[PDB]
Point group: D2
Chain length 318, copies 4
Amino acid sequence: DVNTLTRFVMEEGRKARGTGELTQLLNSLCTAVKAISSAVRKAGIAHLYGIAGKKLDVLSNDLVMNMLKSSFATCVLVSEEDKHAIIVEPEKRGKYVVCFDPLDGSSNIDCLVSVGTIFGIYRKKSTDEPSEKDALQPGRNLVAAGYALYGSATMLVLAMDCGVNCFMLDPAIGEFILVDKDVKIKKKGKIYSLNEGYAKDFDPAVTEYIQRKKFPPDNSAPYGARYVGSMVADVHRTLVYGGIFLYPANKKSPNGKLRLLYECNPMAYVMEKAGGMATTGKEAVLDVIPTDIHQRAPVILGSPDDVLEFLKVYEKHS
Amino acid sequence: DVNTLTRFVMEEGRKARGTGELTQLLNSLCTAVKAISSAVRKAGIAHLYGIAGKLDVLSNDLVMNMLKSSFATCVLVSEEDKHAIIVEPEKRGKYVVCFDPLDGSSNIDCLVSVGTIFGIYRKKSTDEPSEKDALQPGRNLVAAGYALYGSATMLVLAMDCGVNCFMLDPAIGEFILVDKDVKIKKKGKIYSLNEGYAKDFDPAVTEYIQRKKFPPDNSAPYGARYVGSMVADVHRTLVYGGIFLYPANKKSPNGKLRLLYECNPMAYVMEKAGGMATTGKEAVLDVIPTDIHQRAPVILGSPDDVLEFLKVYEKHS
Amino acid sequence: DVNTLTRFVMEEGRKARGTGELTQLLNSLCTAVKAISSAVRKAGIAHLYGIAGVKKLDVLSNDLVMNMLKSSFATCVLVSEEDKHAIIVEPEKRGKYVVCFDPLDGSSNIDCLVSVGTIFGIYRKKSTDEPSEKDALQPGRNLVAAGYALYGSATMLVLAMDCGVNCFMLDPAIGEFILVDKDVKIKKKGKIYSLNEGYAKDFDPAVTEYIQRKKFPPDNSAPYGARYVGSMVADVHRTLVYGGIFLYPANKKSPNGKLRLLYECNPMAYVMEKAGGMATTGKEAVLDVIPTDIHQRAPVILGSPDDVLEFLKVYEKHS
Amino acid sequence: DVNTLTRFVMEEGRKARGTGELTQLLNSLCTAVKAISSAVRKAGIAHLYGIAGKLDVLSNDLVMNMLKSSFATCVLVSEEDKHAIIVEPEKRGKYVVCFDPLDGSSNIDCLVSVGTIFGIYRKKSTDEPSEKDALQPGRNLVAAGYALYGSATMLVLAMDCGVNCFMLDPAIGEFILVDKDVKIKKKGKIYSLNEGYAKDFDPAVTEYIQRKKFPPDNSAPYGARYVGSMVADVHRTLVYGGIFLYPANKKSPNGKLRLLYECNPMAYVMEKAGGMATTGKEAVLDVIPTDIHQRAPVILGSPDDVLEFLKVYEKHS
Ligand SMILES: O=C(NCCCCCCCNC(=O)NS(=O)(=O)c1cccc(Cl)c1)NS(=O)(=O)c1cccc(Cl)c1
Ligand SMILES: O=C(NCCCCCCCNC(=O)NS(=O)(=O)c1cccc(Cl)c1)NS(=O)(=O)c1cccc(Cl)c1
């Protein structure tokens, strides 16, 4: 039978005997994603070009902020767009903390590269007044995470304790349709994904690993390379086709480049739920304990046999 | 003033004192692109999944049916069809169109940007229409372009007047002119190829890429981007400058992209925007085709970058 | 704060401390309505006309509602204009609710692009018996929720429950129903009357007299304007919004009127009443008719309370 | 083969050896209409209600702006505007357009069908354009028609070649030709007028209606329909046959509907579809207006319904 995001969420919610506050959050977010999608695909751009006589990142942020606030399910919202945590007004406060990138990859949307919305959802743990500290939970504490991808089609990928599920937005009806259920990543893939433009900056572990992928020691076939440069796009591919995605530390980004709270954690959560792995090189992404909301981490994620092969190499270089 | 594709093509025709046949072709094409765009973004997918109780083929059928019915074509060459399609006598116009109705669709299961690529020729002889009519060098192109189905859907159309970019507004289904007479940066900061296959690289390609990552001087190393969808990679090259490479090697001495409906259209866009497109040995546009599906090596982008490639290429020749 | 139908229903449910089953029902029904709207506005019509080289809309509409409602896990008995007998939801899918609906009301004339619509009325199964056709035979008083989707110049969902009447505009850019008119009430007295006057020769002498009062007021007031779209959902919606009176009365040729009680008259009666309006057969409240056949007809006179009362006065004067 | 408004029009223009200017006009109108439809169906309404924290006026702006930049017009008359608009010299073309950008919008509050009405004239004179160029009998129309935003959006376009109906497919933003060379029923079974004005009716209209409810030849009484939006009523009249009436009353002694951009275009469509359109005294299209907003009575529809009305009229003088 046809399943929709709204039906699905509600039925997982009813099974879990919940009060429906996460559903309202998830419903509000779905609504925001469909609105983001519509702007991203440029509906109404004719009016901007004078048919009758905000920047996308800013609008997408406003969509997500306003929908989550008005859901009555959140208290603290961290956004790539906002310098400090946003604290929901008392009258609209609920139990959840949400970290999100409202339009990841947007820096290069001028070229119509896939962009995405990434989100991670935590239960507020502290009984203190809500503040920025509430979003400084390790990703292991994630209740649910995921992303919407505005690629050739729009897709929302939702990860919960019950698994990873993939919904396609049908823009003729503004409905997310369940198309891939309880999704698992391939044990081993055949694609590696990273900016090799930073080759001069790589630590020897990354350098050796990539040399293994191009000139395999067992004389198997070399891995293919893909690198969109938009994280949602690369991670989705990695989930769908298997393989490995990398954004290691470099001289410009000595703590890595991607943001822990709202890029690494949500993706690592989706990966782990689908049977994959995500590591900083020293430790599972999900184990890192944040100290700063916009702090960065290095990340290697994807198929378990690929990440493990990377960590055998990492261990080799100590 | 607001400018749409329908308006744009029609005013160019009137300048050129044309009959409207190219305009009828381009309108039909653009109609096909809106339809492919609607299907790629998955409108109606709820019905497939039972709310009430292929894509590359559809895209092919759309382009093929709109073009035939435009009354402006006589010979249609598609990546999807083994032979050239000869238009029925009653529907024959003067143009020969080569196209890839959905480029990059091999990986569409991961929602990668995809595209439609097309190149339009004037039929050069009065012989009965046949595949030979599509075997013209890229130099002979009348119009070429691509539709990119990315974050948004954009039509890039190159003609003698230059390269013009039109954004699809799905709310009304109009291609709105958003970037006029566009030109590529003289030199970029990005390189684009599949490095996974480095061991099969031609020596020249190895050296050039090495130099992009490890510059001899004080310059920054280039960034690397590779979508694996030609339309997406070329359009980024257009917007940001740089270089896109699908070069020849020993196991593929004519490369892998198809000349008629991938390489040539993109090479024509690049040249009209002030870029270059080479096989290593000659401009892609000067290759005289002998087979409609023949392969061609392609290296394109900012002129400084493509010339630096040719410097390294020739070093190894 | 912005309010979408999904959000609205959810917050009513929590104020009623409900299990969520009627929300699932309504959620499902809104999905079907967006799909009906999309089909009605002729999305994809280019494919029928050979752009790349089939069901009638009322059939597609029935298929959509039936299917979304069955899969909501919230229904047990479904009556639709399309089907001779009640549909009994399969055991694995059963829920507590009974739905009577008209999937694409007015679609006979759809060829002229007339406004069409979907009407629905929801009940709780009363009996402990196995679900059957009997469970649909409740008087409209027993309605939990009712309403319609109007596919007109825009698509609107009017929902009426105990809390009153709320109107939700469908934003087709994003597939959301946005609450635009809240706790809606009809005018005490309107200035338009609505019926097929072309069949005047068969009119009830009471209806004849009333329409004459409207066209030739005995009292120096301005005569009413007439509007009759010919599509119940459009006329009833205009009745709610501008006030006035809509008629489909019983005559000699048709002692029980023409519209169907369970999935046409009842829901509009229920919406009218929750908006402070009235709906009568001429003899009783439409909502008070205890039905004995799921496809039985009932006369209907509805709209602003003063207008309906004035009709009743005339009607009772002819006994 | 599939046909689009874009393609249909361009192909009529080529058969006529036209210079393309009317095509540019109609393409522009086409675009304006899709943008009106998107607005009417309430796309974007969520942004009005705070999702991220006038309809008649927008419609007018869309038609006015699109027509001006079409380079094809010189005098624009609108229901929305007191005086005729004179297109500036640089955007000036040879056509006059009179239009109602959102007919029936005074009750759009209840989501009644609304529509756009247009009629197009050629300016012959070498005079500087002026309001009075719009003062022409409908007989002089080059093209006319309407777009109806009902359950679906349909453009009806009437030209010398006949009447052609185009459904807007909003999936792709394209007008698809669905009904070719349309001809109205010889006689219908629906009459359409506001019977709330019966106290005011001329005895000729009273009698005619009486004939509808009580047929003298013992045929079946007609049904009555009255949306109250002219485009919806007239369109149902084109599709199902019958008769439409807005005659003179007390509040509107010269009729209520506007000759130049309600009556004339509907009359012209009706006549091109083999129907009729009469003030009672003469053909609508034969009226010579002296005021761009002048009112006219209109009785239109199936020819045998119109003659039966006129038969009754000619009896009461
Ligand atoms: O979703 C969850 N439980 C189900 C939702 C229960 C709360 C929302 C519905 C409120 N109640 C009604 O609507 N009642 S009614 O329908 O009878 C009604 C009554 C009167 C009027 C109307 Cl219109 C309706 N829990 S969770 O969100 O914590 C969750 C936990 C785990 C995983 C996920 Cl994804 C989610
Ligand atoms: O576009 C081109 N020429 C201008 C086309 C416009 C004029 C001729 C169009 C057909 N005639 C009409 O429509 N006449 S009408 O409007 O009076 C009319 C008359 C009766 C009915 C109706 Cl509805 C209309 N040439 S091109 O295609 O070779 C080209 C060349 C170079 C670059 C490009 Cl992109 C294109």
